[PDB]
Design a protein around this ligand. Structure first.
Ligand SMILES: C[C@H]1O[C@H](O[C@H]2[C@H](O)[C@@H](O)[C@@H](O[C@H]3[C@H](O)[C@@H](O)[C@@H](O)O[C@@H]3CO)O[C@@H]2CO)[C@H](O)[C@@H](O)[C@@H]1N[C@H]1C=C(CO)[C@@H](O)[C@H](O)[C@H]1O
Ligand SMILES: C[C@H]1O[C@H](O[C@H]2[C@H](O)[C@@H](O)[C@@H](O[C@H]3[C@H](O)[C@@H](O)[C@@H](O)O[C@@H]3CO)O[C@@H]2CO)[C@H](O)[C@@H](O)[C@@H]1N[C@H]1C=C(CO)[C@@H](O)[C@H](O)[C@H]1O
Ligand SMILES: [Ca+2]
Ligand SMILES: [Ca+2]
Ligand code: NA
Ligand code: NA
Length: 481
Protein backbone atom coordinates (compact mmCIF):
# COMPACT_ATOMS: atom_id res chain seq x y z
CA UNK A 1 0.00 0.00 0.00
CA UNK A 2 2.79 2.59 0.74
CA UNK A 3 4.52 3.70 -2.49
CA UNK A 4 8.32 3.53 -2.65
CA UNK A 5 10.53 4.79 -5.46
CA UNK A 6 14.00 3.60 -6.42
CA UNK A 7 16.50 5.53 -8.49
CA UNK A 8 17.84 2.56 -10.43
CA UNK A 9 21.38 3.73 -11.26
CA UNK A 10 24.48 5.47 -9.97
CA UNK A 11 27.08 7.52 -11.82
CA UNK A 12 29.94 5.02 -11.98
CA UNK A 13 28.21 1.81 -13.06
CA UNK A 14 30.38 -0.15 -15.50
CA UNK A 15 29.87 0.48 -19.21
CA UNK A 16 29.18 -3.19 -20.05
CA UNK A 17 25.74 -2.81 -21.62
CA UNK A 18 24.15 -5.13 -19.04
CA UNK A 19 22.17 -2.68 -16.86
CA UNK A 20 18.74 -3.25 -18.46
CA UNK A 21 19.25 -7.04 -18.07
CA UNK A 22 20.26 -6.49 -14.42
CA UNK A 23 17.12 -4.45 -13.86
CA UNK A 24 15.02 -7.21 -15.44
CA UNK A 25 16.71 -9.75 -13.16
CA UNK A 26 16.19 -7.56 -10.06
CA UNK A 27 12.44 -7.15 -10.57
CA UNK A 28 11.37 -9.97 -8.17
CA UNK A 29 13.70 -8.67 -5.43
CA UNK A 30 12.36 -5.12 -5.90
CA UNK A 31 8.74 -6.27 -5.76
CA UNK A 32 9.46 -8.44 -2.71
CA UNK A 33 11.00 -5.47 -0.85
CA UNK A 34 8.04 -3.10 -1.58
CA UNK A 35 9.48 -0.98 -4.44
CA UNK A 36 6.51 0.30 -6.47
CA UNK A 37 8.28 2.51 -9.01
CA UNK A 38 11.71 2.86 -10.53
CA UNK A 39 13.33 5.93 -12.02
CA UNK A 40 15.55 4.61 -14.84
CA UNK A 41 18.52 6.54 -16.23
CA UNK A 42 18.09 8.44 -19.52
CA UNK A 43 17.45 5.70 -22.07
CA UNK A 44 18.53 7.47 -25.32
CA UNK A 45 21.87 7.88 -27.10
CA UNK A 46 24.32 10.29 -25.44
CA UNK A 47 27.57 11.69 -26.86
CA UNK A 48 29.34 8.34 -26.48
CA UNK A 49 28.57 4.80 -25.34
CA UNK A 50 29.76 5.56 -21.78
CA UNK A 51 27.54 8.64 -21.41
CA UNK A 52 25.50 8.32 -18.15
CA UNK A 53 22.66 9.70 -20.33
CA UNK A 54 22.59 13.47 -19.80
CA UNK A 55 24.46 14.18 -23.04
CA UNK A 56 21.21 13.75 -24.98
CA UNK A 57 22.36 13.35 -28.57
CA UNK A 58 19.32 11.55 -30.01
CA UNK A 59 16.09 11.25 -28.07
CA UNK A 60 14.68 8.80 -30.68
CA UNK A 61 17.69 6.39 -30.40
CA UNK A 62 16.89 4.21 -27.36
CA UNK A 63 19.89 1.93 -28.04
CA UNK A 64 18.55 1.05 -31.49
CA UNK A 65 20.78 2.77 -34.11
CA UNK A 66 24.54 2.72 -34.67
CA UNK A 67 25.31 6.32 -33.67
CA UNK A 68 28.26 7.67 -31.61
CA UNK A 69 30.28 4.49 -32.01
CA UNK A 70 27.61 2.15 -30.59
CA UNK A 71 24.14 0.67 -31.04
CA UNK A 72 23.45 0.13 -27.35
CA UNK A 73 23.46 2.97 -24.89
CA UNK A 74 25.63 2.51 -21.75
CA UNK A 75 22.78 0.52 -20.29
CA UNK A 76 21.89 -1.76 -23.24
CA UNK A 77 19.55 -2.02 -26.20
CA UNK A 78 15.96 -0.80 -26.65
CA UNK A 79 14.70 -4.39 -26.65
CA UNK A 80 16.53 -5.16 -23.40
CA UNK A 81 15.02 -2.09 -21.77
CA UNK A 82 11.52 -3.04 -23.03
CA UNK A 83 11.97 -6.57 -21.60
CA UNK A 84 13.06 -5.08 -18.24
CA UNK A 85 9.99 -2.80 -18.26
CA UNK A 86 7.61 -5.68 -19.02
CA UNK A 87 9.15 -7.66 -16.11
CA UNK A 88 8.74 -4.70 -13.75
CA UNK A 89 5.15 -4.19 -14.96
CA UNK A 90 4.43 -7.92 -14.40
CA UNK A 91 5.00 -7.21 -10.69
CA UNK A 92 3.12 -3.88 -10.78
CA UNK A 93 6.28 -1.80 -10.54
CA UNK A 94 5.82 1.52 -12.36
CA UNK A 95 8.58 2.99 -14.51
CA UNK A 96 9.53 6.66 -14.67
CA UNK A 97 11.68 7.74 -17.60
CA UNK A 98 14.30 10.44 -17.29
CA UNK A 99 13.57 13.41 -19.51
CA UNK A 100 16.64 15.39 -20.64
CA UNK A 101 15.35 18.26 -22.79
CA UNK A 102 17.40 21.27 -21.63
CA UNK A 103 20.06 20.79 -24.30
CA UNK A 104 21.53 18.52 -26.98
CA UNK A 105 25.15 17.30 -26.88
CA UNK A 106 27.38 15.65 -29.47
CA UNK A 107 26.12 17.33 -32.65
CA UNK A 108 27.09 15.60 -35.89
CA UNK A 109 28.67 18.74 -37.38
CA UNK A 110 29.50 22.38 -36.67
CA UNK A 111 27.84 25.40 -38.17
CA UNK A 112 29.13 28.95 -38.51
CA UNK A 113 27.04 31.04 -36.16
CA UNK A 114 27.09 34.74 -35.27
CA UNK A 115 27.21 35.10 -31.48
CA UNK A 116 28.12 37.26 -28.52
CA UNK A 117 29.75 36.23 -25.30
CA UNK A 118 27.85 36.63 -22.03
CA UNK A 119 29.10 36.83 -18.44
CA UNK A 120 28.90 33.40 -16.82
CA UNK A 121 27.94 34.97 -13.44
CA UNK A 122 25.32 37.21 -15.13
CA UNK A 123 24.10 35.85 -18.45
CA UNK A 124 21.95 38.96 -19.05
CA UNK A 125 25.21 40.91 -19.45
CA UNK A 126 26.78 40.83 -22.96
CA UNK A 127 30.61 40.89 -22.89
CA UNK A 128 31.60 41.01 -26.58
CA UNK A 129 30.54 42.37 -29.90
CA UNK A 130 29.29 39.97 -32.56
CA UNK A 131 31.74 37.28 -33.62
CA UNK A 132 31.68 34.28 -35.89
CA UNK A 133 31.99 30.96 -34.02
CA UNK A 134 31.91 27.28 -35.02
CA UNK A 135 29.18 25.69 -32.91
CA UNK A 136 28.19 22.04 -32.48
CA UNK A 137 24.57 22.58 -33.49
CA UNK A 138 23.82 20.46 -36.59
CA UNK A 139 22.00 17.20 -35.79
CA UNK A 140 21.32 14.95 -38.79
CA UNK A 141 21.26 11.54 -37.03
CA UNK A 142 23.06 9.63 -39.80
CA UNK A 143 22.62 6.19 -38.20
CA UNK A 144 18.90 6.70 -37.66
CA UNK A 145 17.82 8.62 -40.79
CA UNK A 146 14.16 9.59 -40.57
CA UNK A 147 12.99 6.45 -38.73
CA UNK A 148 10.46 7.64 -36.06
CA UNK A 149 11.13 11.35 -36.76
CA UNK A 150 12.44 13.37 -39.69
CA UNK A 151 13.08 16.41 -37.46
CA UNK A 152 16.63 17.78 -37.89
CA UNK A 153 18.25 20.34 -35.54
CA UNK A 154 20.19 23.45 -36.54
CA UNK A 155 21.73 26.42 -34.67
CA UNK A 156 18.43 28.36 -34.82
CA UNK A 157 16.76 25.75 -32.62
CA UNK A 158 19.17 26.74 -29.82
CA UNK A 159 19.87 29.87 -27.78
CA UNK A 160 23.57 29.26 -27.40
CA UNK A 161 26.49 27.03 -26.64
CA UNK A 162 29.61 26.82 -24.46
CA UNK A 163 32.19 25.94 -27.11
CA UNK A 164 33.64 27.59 -30.19
CA UNK A 165 35.45 24.92 -32.22
CA UNK A 166 37.33 27.51 -34.37
CA UNK A 167 39.19 29.26 -31.53
CA UNK A 168 38.91 26.12 -29.36
CA UNK A 169 37.47 28.09 -26.52
CA UNK A 170 35.09 27.58 -23.58
CA UNK A 171 32.74 30.54 -22.92
CA UNK A 172 29.00 31.12 -22.97
CA UNK A 173 27.92 32.24 -26.44
CA UNK A 174 24.40 33.57 -27.10
CA UNK A 175 23.44 33.25 -30.75
CA UNK A 176 22.40 36.14 -32.98
CA UNK A 177 18.70 36.99 -32.62
CA UNK A 178 18.25 34.72 -29.59
CA UNK A 179 17.22 35.54 -26.05
CA UNK A 180 17.57 33.43 -22.94
CA UNK A 181 14.23 31.86 -22.07
CA UNK A 182 12.12 33.02 -19.15
CA UNK A 183 10.89 31.96 -16.59
CA UNK A 184 13.98 30.05 -15.47
CA UNK A 185 16.10 30.24 -12.33
CA UNK A 186 17.32 33.83 -11.72
CA UNK A 187 20.65 32.41 -10.50
CA UNK A 188 23.54 33.86 -12.53
CA UNK A 189 21.06 36.53 -13.67
CA UNK A 190 19.34 33.98 -15.93
CA UNK A 191 20.18 30.25 -15.68
CA UNK A 192 18.73 29.13 -19.01
CA UNK A 193 22.24 28.18 -20.16
CA UNK A 194 23.75 25.07 -18.50
CA UNK A 195 25.78 23.00 -20.99
CA UNK A 196 26.05 21.75 -24.58
CA UNK A 197 23.71 23.44 -27.14
CA UNK A 198 20.91 25.10 -25.21
CA UNK A 199 17.42 24.45 -26.60
CA UNK A 200 15.42 27.60 -27.55
CA UNK A 201 11.99 27.21 -25.92
CA UNK A 202 10.79 30.39 -27.62
CA UNK A 203 10.87 28.49 -30.94
CA UNK A 204 7.40 27.11 -31.85
CA UNK A 205 8.74 24.17 -33.94
CA UNK A 206 10.91 23.16 -30.93
CA UNK A 207 8.04 23.29 -28.44
CA UNK A 208 5.88 21.21 -30.81
CA UNK A 209 8.71 18.69 -31.44
CA UNK A 210 9.62 18.11 -27.81
CA UNK A 211 5.94 17.59 -26.86
CA UNK A 212 5.54 15.11 -29.71
CA UNK A 213 8.75 13.28 -28.73
CA UNK A 214 7.42 13.14 -25.13
CA UNK A 215 4.36 11.18 -26.26
CA UNK A 216 6.48 8.91 -28.47
CA UNK A 217 8.89 8.18 -25.60
CA UNK A 218 6.02 7.40 -23.23
CA UNK A 219 4.51 4.96 -25.78
CA UNK A 220 7.79 3.35 -26.84
CA UNK A 221 8.70 2.39 -23.24
CA UNK A 222 5.16 2.16 -21.75
CA UNK A 223 6.22 4.70 -19.14
CA UNK A 224 4.05 5.36 -16.09
CA UNK A 225 5.69 8.71 -15.40
CA UNK A 226 8.74 10.95 -15.65
CA UNK A 227 11.76 12.41 -13.88
CA UNK A 228 12.44 15.85 -15.37
CA UNK A 229 16.08 16.83 -15.69
CA UNK A 230 17.54 20.26 -14.99
CA UNK A 231 14.27 22.17 -14.62
CA UNK A 232 16.01 25.31 -13.28
CA UNK A 233 17.24 25.77 -16.86
CA UNK A 234 14.03 25.14 -18.81
CA UNK A 235 11.16 27.60 -19.31
CA UNK A 236 8.76 26.72 -16.45
CA UNK A 237 5.52 27.31 -18.41
CA UNK A 238 6.86 24.97 -21.10
CA UNK A 239 7.51 22.22 -18.54
CA UNK A 240 3.97 22.69 -17.23
CA UNK A 241 2.54 22.47 -20.78
CA UNK A 242 4.70 19.46 -21.72
CA UNK A 243 3.49 17.45 -18.70
CA UNK A 244 -0.14 18.40 -19.50
CA UNK A 245 0.35 17.49 -23.18
CA UNK A 246 1.74 14.00 -22.50
CA UNK A 247 -0.94 13.25 -19.91
CA UNK A 248 -3.64 14.38 -22.33
CA UNK A 249 -2.24 12.23 -25.18
CA UNK A 250 -1.57 9.08 -23.15
CA UNK A 251 -4.71 9.34 -20.99
CA UNK A 252 -2.56 8.24 -18.00
CA UNK A 253 -1.73 9.94 -14.70
CA UNK A 254 2.01 10.07 -15.57
CA UNK A 255 3.33 10.83 -12.13
CA UNK A 256 6.18 13.37 -12.66
CA UNK A 257 9.00 14.57 -10.36
CA UNK A 258 11.26 17.48 -11.34
CA UNK A 259 14.89 17.97 -10.30
CA UNK A 260 15.03 21.63 -9.26
CA UNK A 261 18.42 21.79 -7.58
CA UNK A 262 18.23 24.44 -4.87
CA UNK A 263 18.67 24.20 -1.12
CA UNK A 264 15.85 26.71 -0.66
CA UNK A 265 12.17 26.00 -0.02
CA UNK A 266 11.13 29.44 -1.35
CA UNK A 267 12.69 28.82 -4.77
CA UNK A 268 11.03 25.41 -4.94
CA UNK A 269 7.65 26.88 -3.98
CA UNK A 270 7.99 29.46 -6.77
CA UNK A 271 8.65 26.60 -9.23
CA UNK A 272 5.62 24.66 -7.95
CA UNK A 273 3.43 27.78 -8.21
CA UNK A 274 4.60 28.51 -11.78
CA UNK A 275 3.91 24.94 -12.86
CA UNK A 276 0.43 25.01 -11.16
CA UNK A 277 1.43 22.18 -8.77
CA UNK A 278 1.01 19.66 -11.62
CA UNK A 279 4.10 17.72 -10.60
CA UNK A 280 6.41 16.93 -7.69
CA UNK A 281 9.96 18.07 -6.89
CA UNK A 282 12.86 16.32 -5.19
CA UNK A 283 13.24 17.42 -1.54
CA UNK A 284 16.63 19.02 -1.97
CA UNK A 285 16.61 20.87 1.37
CA UNK A 286 15.95 17.66 3.28
CA UNK A 287 18.92 16.05 1.50
CA UNK A 288 21.14 18.93 2.74
CA UNK A 289 19.88 18.59 6.34
CA UNK A 290 20.79 14.88 6.24
CA UNK A 291 24.19 15.78 4.87
CA UNK A 292 24.69 18.41 7.61
CA UNK A 293 23.58 16.07 10.41
CA UNK A 294 25.86 13.32 9.09
CA UNK A 295 28.93 15.63 9.17
CA UNK A 296 28.47 17.42 12.55
CA UNK A 297 29.27 14.59 14.99
CA UNK A 298 26.14 15.09 17.15
CA UNK A 299 26.32 18.91 17.09
CA UNK A 300 23.34 19.15 14.71
CA UNK A 301 19.99 20.02 16.24
CA UNK A 302 17.86 17.12 15.01
CA UNK A 303 14.68 19.13 15.68
CA UNK A 304 15.58 21.05 12.52
CA UNK A 305 14.55 18.08 10.33
CA UNK A 306 10.88 19.15 10.66
CA UNK A 307 11.34 22.63 9.07
CA UNK A 308 12.49 24.21 5.81
CA UNK A 309 11.87 21.13 3.63
CA UNK A 310 9.46 20.50 0.78
CA UNK A 311 8.00 17.53 2.70
CA UNK A 312 7.28 19.79 5.71
CA UNK A 313 5.10 22.15 3.62
CA UNK A 314 3.95 20.35 0.47
CA UNK A 315 4.17 16.65 1.34
CA UNK A 316 2.01 15.55 -1.61
CA UNK A 317 4.51 17.17 -3.98
CA UNK A 318 7.75 15.99 -2.29
CA UNK A 319 9.92 13.14 -3.41
CA UNK A 320 12.25 12.57 -0.50
CA UNK A 321 15.69 11.03 -0.87
CA UNK A 322 19.01 10.57 0.87
CA UNK A 323 21.54 10.63 -1.98
CA UNK A 324 21.58 10.58 -5.76
CA UNK A 325 23.96 10.27 -8.75
CA UNK A 326 25.03 13.94 -8.40
CA UNK A 327 25.49 13.95 -4.58
CA UNK A 328 27.51 10.73 -4.45
CA UNK A 329 31.29 10.93 -3.92
CA UNK A 330 33.18 12.66 -6.73
CA UNK A 331 30.12 14.04 -8.54
CA UNK A 332 29.03 17.58 -9.32
CA UNK A 333 26.68 18.19 -6.36
CA UNK A 334 28.84 16.12 -3.93
CA UNK A 335 27.20 16.31 -0.47
CA UNK A 336 27.07 12.68 0.49
CA UNK A 337 25.16 11.58 3.58
CA UNK A 338 27.85 9.86 5.60
CA UNK A 339 27.63 6.06 5.94
CA UNK A 340 26.93 6.01 9.73
CA UNK A 341 23.94 8.36 9.39
CA UNK A 342 22.54 6.91 6.17
CA UNK A 343 20.22 4.32 7.78
CA UNK A 344 18.78 7.02 10.07
CA UNK A 345 18.05 9.19 7.03
CA UNK A 346 16.37 6.19 5.34
CA UNK A 347 14.21 5.62 8.46
CA UNK A 348 13.13 9.28 8.28
CA UNK A 349 12.00 9.05 4.63
CA UNK A 350 10.64 5.49 4.70
CA UNK A 351 8.68 5.28 7.94
CA UNK A 352 7.12 8.75 8.21
CA UNK A 353 3.79 9.41 6.54
CA UNK A 354 4.76 12.56 4.59
CA UNK A 355 6.38 12.39 1.14
CA UNK A 356 7.02 9.89 -1.65
CA UNK A 357 10.37 8.33 -0.63
CA UNK A 358 13.11 7.27 -2.99
CA UNK A 359 15.94 4.83 -2.34
CA UNK A 360 19.22 5.14 -4.20
CA UNK A 361 20.87 2.31 -6.17
CA UNK A 362 24.28 3.58 -4.99
CA UNK A 363 23.19 3.21 -1.35
CA UNK A 364 21.73 -0.29 -1.84
CA UNK A 365 24.49 -1.75 -3.92
CA UNK A 366 27.39 0.66 -3.39
CA UNK A 367 29.02 3.02 -5.90
CA UNK A 368 31.75 1.91 -8.33
CA UNK A 369 33.87 5.01 -8.70
CA UNK A 370 37.64 4.82 -8.59
CA UNK A 371 38.04 6.51 -5.12
CA UNK A 372 38.44 5.11 -1.59
CA UNK A 373 35.40 7.22 -0.59
CA UNK A 374 32.75 5.20 -2.45
CA UNK A 375 29.41 4.50 -0.80
CA UNK A 376 29.52 0.90 0.49
CA UNK A 377 26.62 -1.45 -0.24
CA UNK A 378 24.06 -0.82 2.52
CA UNK A 379 21.32 -3.15 1.26
CA UNK A 380 21.39 -5.21 4.44
CA UNK A 381 20.91 -2.15 6.71
CA UNK A 382 18.22 -0.60 4.44
CA UNK A 383 16.17 -3.82 3.90
CA UNK A 384 14.62 -3.91 7.44
CA UNK A 385 13.63 -0.22 7.03
CA UNK A 386 12.01 -1.04 3.67
CA UNK A 387 10.13 -3.86 5.32
CA UNK A 388 9.04 -1.44 8.09
CA UNK A 389 7.61 0.80 5.35
CA UNK A 390 5.99 -2.04 3.42
CA UNK A 391 4.37 -3.84 6.35
CA UNK A 392 4.26 -1.49 9.35
CA UNK A 393 4.32 2.24 8.53
CA UNK A 394 0.55 2.90 8.49
CA UNK A 395 -1.97 4.91 10.49
CA UNK A 396 -1.80 8.03 12.61
CA UNK A 397 1.64 9.48 13.30
CA UNK A 398 2.99 11.00 16.54
CA UNK A 399 6.18 13.07 16.47
CA UNK A 400 8.76 13.37 19.24
CA UNK A 401 11.25 15.96 18.06
CA UNK A 402 11.88 17.19 21.57
CA UNK A 403 15.65 16.72 21.95
CA UNK A 404 18.84 17.93 20.20
CA UNK A 405 19.94 14.32 19.40
CA UNK A 406 17.32 11.61 20.07
CA UNK A 407 14.21 12.10 17.99
CA UNK A 408 11.39 9.73 17.18
CA UNK A 409 7.98 9.08 15.77
CA UNK A 410 5.28 6.41 15.99
CA UNK A 411 2.64 5.04 13.65
CA UNK A 412 -0.48 3.58 15.30
CA UNK A 413 -1.12 1.04 12.53
CA UNK A 414 -4.20 0.73 10.33
CA UNK A 415 -6.79 -2.06 10.49
CA UNK A 416 -6.35 -2.51 6.69
CA UNK A 417 -2.76 -3.78 7.25
CA UNK A 418 -2.58 -6.53 9.86
CA UNK A 419 -0.13 -6.02 12.71
CA UNK A 420 0.89 -2.60 11.40
CA UNK A 421 2.28 0.08 13.68
CA UNK A 422 5.80 1.19 14.54
CA UNK A 423 7.98 3.21 16.92
CA UNK A 424 11.11 4.74 15.38
CA UNK A 425 14.06 6.42 17.10
CA UNK A 426 17.16 7.96 15.57
CA UNK A 427 20.04 9.81 17.19
CA UNK A 428 23.01 11.70 15.79
CA UNK A 429 24.71 11.53 19.21
CA UNK A 430 24.50 9.39 22.37
CA UNK A 431 21.72 6.85 22.65
CA UNK A 432 19.07 6.61 25.30
CA UNK A 433 15.40 5.99 25.79
CA UNK A 434 12.15 7.67 24.87
CA UNK A 435 8.60 6.92 25.97
CA UNK A 436 6.26 7.21 23.00
CA UNK A 437 2.55 6.67 22.39
CA UNK A 438 1.76 4.00 19.75
CA UNK A 439 -2.04 3.80 20.24
CA UNK A 440 -4.19 2.28 23.01
CA UNK A 441 -5.31 -0.27 20.36
CA UNK A 442 -1.79 -1.76 20.61
CA UNK A 443 -1.93 -2.16 24.43
CA UNK A 444 -0.25 -5.38 25.63
CA UNK A 445 1.49 -6.15 22.34
CA UNK A 446 5.17 -7.14 22.44
CA UNK A 447 7.30 -5.18 19.98
CA UNK A 448 10.85 -5.74 18.78
CA UNK A 449 13.44 -3.73 16.80
CA UNK A 450 13.12 -4.82 13.14
CA UNK A 451 16.67 -3.52 12.42
CA UNK A 452 18.17 -5.86 15.06
CA UNK A 453 20.24 -2.95 16.46
CA UNK A 454 18.53 -3.43 19.85
CA UNK A 455 17.74 -6.92 21.11
CA UNK A 456 15.22 -5.90 23.82
CA UNK A 457 11.48 -6.39 23.64
CA UNK A 458 9.08 -3.65 24.53
CA UNK A 459 5.60 -4.40 25.91
CA UNK A 460 3.08 -1.64 25.16
CA UNK A 461 1.25 -0.57 28.35
CA UNK A 462 -2.55 -0.26 28.88
CA UNK A 463 -2.37 3.44 28.05
CA UNK A 464 -0.68 2.77 24.67
CA UNK A 465 2.87 3.84 25.63
CA UNK A 466 6.15 1.96 25.32
CA UNK A 467 9.66 2.70 26.52
CA UNK A 468 11.84 2.48 23.43
CA UNK A 469 15.63 2.39 23.24
CA UNK A 470 18.21 3.48 20.67
CA UNK A 471 22.00 3.00 20.55
CA UNK A 472 24.50 5.80 20.00
CA UNK A 473 24.50 7.12 16.44
CA UNK A 474 21.90 4.53 15.57
CA UNK A 475 18.33 3.75 14.52
CA UNK A 476 15.75 1.43 16.05
CA UNK A 477 12.33 0.69 14.61
CA UNK A 478 10.09 -1.34 16.88
CA UNK A 479 7.19 -3.31 15.44
CA UNK A 480 4.93 -6.08 16.66
CA UNK A 481 6.60 -9.52 16.96
C1 LIG B 1 24.63 18.63 -11.94
C2 LIG B 1 23.56 19.69 -11.70
O1 LIG B 1 24.09 20.94 -12.16
C3 LIG B 1 23.26 22.08 -11.93
O2 LIG B 1 23.24 22.33 -10.52
C4 LIG B 1 23.89 23.53 -10.06
C5 LIG B 1 22.87 24.32 -9.27
O3 LIG B 1 21.77 24.71 -10.10
C6 LIG B 1 23.53 25.55 -8.64
O4 LIG B 1 22.60 26.25 -7.82
C7 LIG B 1 24.74 25.15 -7.81
O5 LIG B 1 24.30 24.32 -6.73
C8 LIG B 1 24.81 24.63 -5.43
C9 LIG B 1 23.62 24.95 -4.55
O6 LIG B 1 22.83 26.00 -5.11
C10 LIG B 1 24.09 25.35 -3.15
O7 LIG B 1 23.01 25.06 -2.25
C11 LIG B 1 25.45 24.76 -2.71
O8 LIG B 1 25.36 24.25 -1.37
O9 LIG B 1 26.06 23.73 -3.53
C12 LIG B 1 25.53 23.43 -4.83
C13 LIG B 1 26.69 22.91 -5.69
O10 LIG B 1 27.57 23.99 -6.04
O11 LIG B 1 25.66 24.42 -8.61
C14 LIG B 1 25.10 23.23 -9.17
C15 LIG B 1 26.24 22.52 -9.89
O12 LIG B 1 26.56 23.25 -11.06
C16 LIG B 1 21.83 21.86 -12.45
O13 LIG B 1 20.97 22.88 -11.95
C17 LIG B 1 21.27 20.49 -12.06
O14 LIG B 1 20.03 20.30 -12.72
C18 LIG B 1 22.27 19.42 -12.47
N1 LIG B 1 21.77 18.04 -12.35
C19 LIG B 1 21.16 17.33 -13.49
C20 LIG B 1 21.53 17.93 -14.84
C21 LIG B 1 22.46 17.38 -15.64
C22 LIG B 1 22.66 17.97 -17.02
O15 LIG B 1 21.72 17.30 -17.87
C23 LIG B 1 23.26 16.15 -15.25
O16 LIG B 1 24.66 16.37 -15.46
C24 LIG B 1 22.99 15.70 -13.80
O17 LIG B 1 23.48 14.37 -13.62
C25 LIG B 1 21.48 15.83 -13.54
O18 LIG B 1 20.98 15.15 -12.37
C1 LIG C 1 3.31 7.24 -3.65
C2 LIG C 1 2.53 8.55 -3.75
O1 LIG C 1 3.28 9.57 -3.09
C3 LIG C 1 2.67 10.87 -3.05
O2 LIG C 1 1.52 10.84 -2.20
C4 LIG C 1 1.78 10.63 -0.80
C5 LIG C 1 2.23 11.93 -0.14
O3 LIG C 1 3.52 12.32 -0.61
C6 LIG C 1 2.31 11.77 1.37
O4 LIG C 1 2.69 13.01 1.93
C7 LIG C 1 0.97 11.32 1.94
O5 LIG C 1 -0.02 12.33 1.70
C8 LIG C 1 -0.80 12.75 2.83
C9 LIG C 1 -0.20 14.02 3.42
O6 LIG C 1 1.09 13.72 3.96
C10 LIG C 1 -1.08 14.59 4.53
O7 LIG C 1 -0.60 15.89 4.92
C11 LIG C 1 -2.56 14.67 4.12
O8 LIG C 1 -2.75 15.73 3.18
O9 LIG C 1 -3.00 13.43 3.53
C12 LIG C 1 -2.24 13.02 2.39
C13 LIG C 1 -2.92 11.80 1.79
O10 LIG C 1 -2.89 10.73 2.74
O11 LIG C 1 0.62 10.09 1.32
C14 LIG C 1 0.51 10.11 -0.11
C15 LIG C 1 0.21 8.68 -0.57
O12 LIG C 1 -1.13 8.35 -0.20
C16 LIG C 1 2.28 11.35 -4.44
O13 LIG C 1 1.50 12.54 -4.33
C17 LIG C 1 1.48 10.30 -5.19
O14 LIG C 1 1.22 10.75 -6.54
C18 LIG C 1 2.24 8.98 -5.18
N1 LIG C 1 1.49 7.98 -5.90
C19 LIG C 1 1.97 7.46 -7.17
C20 LIG C 1 2.86 6.27 -6.94
C21 LIG C 1 2.57 5.01 -7.34
C22 LIG C 1 3.57 3.88 -7.16
O15 LIG C 1 4.69 4.22 -6.33
C23 LIG C 1 1.26 4.69 -8.04
O16 LIG C 1 0.71 3.47 -7.53
C24 LIG C 1 0.22 5.79 -7.87
O17 LIG C 1 -0.85 5.54 -8.80
C25 LIG C 1 0.81 7.16 -8.14
O18 LIG C 1 -0.21 8.15 -8.02
CA1 LIG D 1 18.08 25.95 -20.99
CA1 LIG E 1 15.19 31.65 -26.36
NA1 NA F 1 17.02 28.28 -23.98
NA1 NA G 1 22.46 16.41 17.65
Amino acid sequence: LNGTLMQYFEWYMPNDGQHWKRLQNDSAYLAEHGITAVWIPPAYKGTSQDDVGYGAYDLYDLGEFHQKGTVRTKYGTKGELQSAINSLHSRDINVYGDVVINHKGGADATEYVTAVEVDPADRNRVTSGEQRIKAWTHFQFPGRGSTYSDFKWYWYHFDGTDWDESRKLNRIYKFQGKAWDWEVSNENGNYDYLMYADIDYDHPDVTAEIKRWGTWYANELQLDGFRLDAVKHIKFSFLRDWVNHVREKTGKEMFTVAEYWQNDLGALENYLNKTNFNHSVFDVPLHYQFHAASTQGGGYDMRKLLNGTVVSKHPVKAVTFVDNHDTQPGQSLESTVQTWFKPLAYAFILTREAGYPQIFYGDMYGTKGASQREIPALKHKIEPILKARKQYAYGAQHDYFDHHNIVGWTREGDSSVANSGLAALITDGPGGTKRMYVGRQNAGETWHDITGNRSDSVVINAEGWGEFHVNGGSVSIYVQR
